[PDB]
Amino acid sequence: ANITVFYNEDFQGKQVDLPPGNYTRAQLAALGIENNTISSVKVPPGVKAILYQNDGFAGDQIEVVANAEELGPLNNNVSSIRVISVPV
Numbered sequence: 724a725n726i727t728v729f730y731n732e733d734f735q736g737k738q739v740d741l742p743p744g745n746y747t748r749a750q751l752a753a754l755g756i757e758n759n760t761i762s763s764v765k766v767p768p769g770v771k772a773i774l775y776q777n778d779g780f781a782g783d784q785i786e787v788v789a790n791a792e793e794l795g796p797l798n799n800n801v802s803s804i805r806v807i808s809v810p811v
């Protein structure tokens with residue numbers, strides 16, 4: 724269903740759920756997710772996310788298909804996100 728993004732690593736701090744969809748920087752902000760703040764993400768079965776360093780779904784990126792306690796180079800550097808349903 725949804726992925727849950729956290730402000731700090733190891734699933735700590737402020738958290739927000741994101742169902743499938745495309746989210747620009749402004750759309751993330753409207754959902755209470757400040758720019759370049761995500762540090763960890765939970766990804767349950769059936770969904771995946773593509774985190775982008777730039778708004779508009781562009782730039783360096785990372786595809787998460789399972790829980791990620793940390794994001795390496797994209798830590799506090801995500802500006803847009805696409806959450807995608809992967810049925811099985």
Ligand SMILES: [Ca+2]
Nearest residue numbers: 730760761762
């Ligand atoms: Ca953070």
Ligand SMILES: [Ca+2]
Nearest residue numbers: 776800801802
């Ligand atoms: Ca960014």
